[PDB]
């Protein structure tokens, strides 16, 4: 049903033009600069939305894929205008599309250096893009269940999620400012610590202030934000119904198991090498770096200077097993890994007792073979996209090991990959920068929503 979509695309980037005012208001609040680009982009986008809101009075499965693909592509290209117009960070069109997509696609990747000495309006709009894509991620993931992903109301949960998503970012900006954080930096870092983005207004994501409390609070609200928000709904609906409503969800149990194991192995390894002089410091930095990278957030508190290269490599692989399915996160949500383990156990039991009926039981209920087949179709598509992205970056002359790290960082919706891409995506080849944008789009779209568009059988 082609040509009935432009109406929504126009109304959507009109909403995004309206979203442009809040950072513009912050620009007029204190005039660091960049006020003109914001207003210019607002008008250009509302005008484009009206041009695309002319085919009206037209409304009638294959369309929804092209809806969400444009909800990320169109909105990223719309968000790529403020960087294009402004003067203080004068960056190429490619770096602008990159920064806009990564801000919106929740991948913490950045291509602008000198964030500290930058107009407070722009580096606010960056965190606001992360917060926006946080809502987009949460709303889309829980409000569209055709691919991957008692039944309550549609809209009442569409607003209960927004209520959790705001009662969290408020309490987190509050705890940050209570820990000695600029209220500006507190809002800008709650926009990005709940959306699991990985962005900061400083070149050192979480090294600008080394307060222990800031690290522990970021860890806490990362664990809170990686958990299935449908499960927080159980803590929201009719108040605090249980404090162990969480522990029933075996996805939560596997998530805490993974986080604790990866933590204590990173801590023991960080002590075998005496990488930090004080174990009270090694504990902090280990827990924070595991919770940051395992949760595909992208925050960094250290430069890996004394760290043995194994620990950053382990964190990159840990990024593969990201957040839970019902929350912001990277690819291969902890539930697909719990399913993989459970199926290995099932196949083991089908060898001792062959003529027995075993079914993949998650939290007491059995799973239809369509879902369990989809989880492994997803593993296959993920792998066969990873390899193509890596070979694409390598083809453009990018460093190979660095290519594999940049791919595993972007397809995982993890902003920083170790290697040549340790703290900036600046000197990356330009074609590799476009292929990287494609990779982050893949990682957000769960490798299926976008690949289908490429398939000939679709068209």
């Amino acid at each position: 049903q082609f040509r009935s979509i432009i109406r929504i695309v126009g109304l959507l980037l009109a909403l995004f033009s309206v979203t442009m005012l809040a950072p513009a208001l912050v620009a007029l609040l204190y005039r660091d600069g960049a006020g003109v680009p914001f207003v210019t982009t607002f008008f250009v986008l509302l005008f484009c939305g009206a041009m695309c809101w002319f085919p009206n009075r037209r409304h009638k499965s294959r369309d929804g894929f092209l809806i969400v693909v444009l909800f990320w592509t169109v909105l990223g290209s719309a968000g790529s205008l403020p960087f294009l117009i402004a003067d203080n960070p004068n960056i190429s069109v490619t770096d602008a599309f990159f920064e806009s997509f990564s801000a919106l696609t929740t991948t913490g990747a950045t291509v602008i250096v000198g964030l500290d000495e930058l107009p407070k309006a722009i580096l606010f709009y960056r965190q606001f893009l992360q917060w926006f894509g946080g809502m987009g991620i949460i709303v889309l993931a829980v409000a569209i269940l055709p691919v991957l992903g008692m039944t309550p109301r549609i809209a009442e949960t569409a607003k209960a999620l927004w209520y959790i998503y705001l009662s969290l970012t408020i309490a987190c900006a509050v705890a940050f400012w209570l820990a000695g954080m600029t209220p500006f930096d507190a809002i800008s870092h709650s926009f990005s610590t709940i959306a699991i983005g990985g962005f900061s207004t400083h070149d050192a994501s979480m090294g600008y202030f080394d307060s222990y409390a800031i690290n522990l609070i970021t860890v806490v609200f990362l664990l809170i934000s990686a958990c299935n928000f449908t499960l927080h709904f159980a803590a929201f609906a009719s108040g605090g119904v249980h404090p162990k409503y969480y522990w029933k969800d075996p996805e939560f149990r596997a998530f805490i198991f993974i986080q604790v194991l990866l933590f204590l192995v990173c801590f023991l390894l960080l002590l075998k090498h005496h990488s930090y002089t004080s174990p009270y410091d090694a504990f902090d930095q280990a827990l924070f770096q595991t919770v940051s990278i395992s949760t595909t957030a992208g925050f960094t508190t250290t430069g890996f200077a004394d760290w043995p290269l194994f620990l950053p490599v382990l964190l990159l692989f840990s990024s593969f097993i990201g957040g839970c399915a019902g929350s912001t996160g990277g690819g291969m949500k902890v539930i697909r890994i719990l399913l993989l383990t459970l199926q290995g156990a099932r196949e083991l039991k089908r060898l001792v007792h062959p003529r027995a009926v075993y079914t993949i039981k998650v939290g007491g209920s059995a799973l239809p073979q369509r879902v369990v087949d989809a989880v492994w179709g997803f593993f296959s598509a993920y792998a066969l996209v990873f390899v193509v992205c890596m070979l694409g970056l390598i083809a453009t002359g990018m460093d190979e090991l660095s290519a594999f790290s940049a791919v595993a960082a972007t397809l995982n919706n993890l902003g920083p990959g170790l290697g040549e891409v340790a703290l900036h995506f600046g000197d990356v080849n330009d074609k590799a920068k476009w292929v990287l944008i494609v990779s982050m789009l893949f990682g957000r779209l769960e490798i299926f929503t976008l690949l289908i568009l490429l398939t000939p059988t679709f068209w």
């Binding site: 009075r57 409304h59 008692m150 039944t151 109301r153 549609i154 809209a155 009442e156």
Partner: protein, 455 residues
Amino acid sequence: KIIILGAGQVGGTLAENLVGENNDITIVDNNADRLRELQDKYDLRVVNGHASHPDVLHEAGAQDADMLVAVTNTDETNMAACQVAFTLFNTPNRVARIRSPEYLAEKEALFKSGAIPVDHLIAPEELVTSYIERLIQYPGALQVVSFAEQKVSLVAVKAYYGGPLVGNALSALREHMPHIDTRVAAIFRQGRPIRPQGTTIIEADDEVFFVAASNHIRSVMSELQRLEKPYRRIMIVGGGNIGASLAKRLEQTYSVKLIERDYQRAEKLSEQLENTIVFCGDAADQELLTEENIDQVDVFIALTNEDETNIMSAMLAKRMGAKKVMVLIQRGAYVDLVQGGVIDVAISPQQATISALLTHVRRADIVNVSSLRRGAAEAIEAVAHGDETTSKVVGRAIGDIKLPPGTTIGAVVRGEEVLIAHDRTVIEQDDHVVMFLVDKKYVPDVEALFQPSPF
């Protein structure tokens, strides 16, 4: 806030109608296939549980949630559910669906207020049977739909060769009852529609659609009942509870021959049914119908389990000489397709219950709310919302509205008074307009016409 028990097949359609302003619906279906289908309807919340168990009931019960509509396939379970509900949680608006019917005989004894069963209103599937009887009572009554809480009623009648409609110009029909204010919506002839005004009603099965207040409709249909020669012989082809109960209710006034495919069912019927010649054969074979005076039967009613068997047997009995043909269609895709000309009327039992229960609904009150029909035509009941100029249609005159093609305004219900649409009339705020489309793909265009400038 409404709770229903969509254990029965019908419930889903009722759920579709109810959704709207200040309405919250909960489905307590026994199993999830029907659930997946029903879930697609927008703005719904479903819980999976047995109908009558207190766990689901407590969710309903703890907050009274206004009306509880207990519609279930099994009657004893529906009654037990409605009672466990009330005497656990009061739920004073409770309703029940019993296809008992024997219980319907003693409904004044067990059900009355203060008793343990605690049933307030009973909705049965018997109405389709009564509706079919009404269809057989009026010789040319192809269809009736009701708008604005039964204030205005649209009727679709058929002109049979030798009837009183045949050969008479529409102006003579208008002059035969000078005290009746009716408005002919459209006239379908040989499948194609026609603009009707002062025109001779061609005998080839012209279908005429009246739109008027229910008092006038009840008068013109009774007059057509008096004029048209009543049907004498009637034939039915299914053995079910509907075929049986319809033969029972009709046999006293007409000569009924019933057909059955299950020999044991035929044997069990012939005992129960007196004055009804009960046969044993497929509704398909001509060798039985011709052998049974198919050329002389007046109305051929098909109440088989299978819809396609109804359609085909009745399409064969229409060719062989039946005057009026009726079927029982359980698939809306079929009823929108076959009810045209070759099959005089298809009776969806879901819409058969809904029309009766929905008529009581205080108001549909949606920018466009349609009543599903034979096809490919539609009759909707638009509501005029908006200020004098913020809406396309409020404050202006009927002759000045740019209605979609084939769209004909039939009547306007203002408050509690009904006036039939002359081109002079002007539409006001919150006025119900009863309309008639000839091509239903223009339903959205009418909504856009009635949708004001968005706030």
